[PDB]
């Protein structure tokens, strides 16, 4: 018998902070593509 | 409102520091899962 609140602990302990760190990378590459002025800035 | 803040900055995270922070979360998820499921 395992604790059924541990699935919510682990799978949100993975996904919520890991999806956070993806966002800081995507907006980093968007600012670099934003300044660069070619074909992707818009 | 009032005027625009001159303390606006930008946030950066290069591709290197992405893989650190991903691997940091998954290894802490591997380590602490066994205790949380008990």
């Amino acid at each position: 018998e395992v604790q059924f609140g541990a699935y919510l602990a682990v799978l949100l302990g993975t996904f919520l902070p890991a999806l956070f760190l993806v966002n800081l990378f995507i907006q980093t590459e968007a600012r670099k593509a934003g300044k660069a002025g070619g074909q992707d800035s818009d | 409102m009032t005027g625009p803040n001159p303390n606006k900055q930008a946030v950066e995270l290069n591709r290197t520091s992405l893989y650190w922070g991903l691997l940091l979360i998954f290894v802490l998820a591997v380590l602490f899962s066994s205790y949380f499921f008990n």
């Binding site: - | 591709r15 991903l22 691997l23 998954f26 591997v30 499921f37």
Partner: peptide, 30 residues
């Protein structure tokens, strides 16, 4: 049902090891 989470954490860890080696930000001089 319980071991399915442990397997997903292990092969999910080996994914980000794969992407870090081959899709690394290649450092360049100048």
């Amino acid at each position: 049902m319980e071991a399915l989470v442990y397997t997903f954490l292990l092969i999910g860890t080996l994914m980000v090891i794969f992407f870090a080696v081959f899709f690394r930000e290649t450092p360049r001089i100048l």
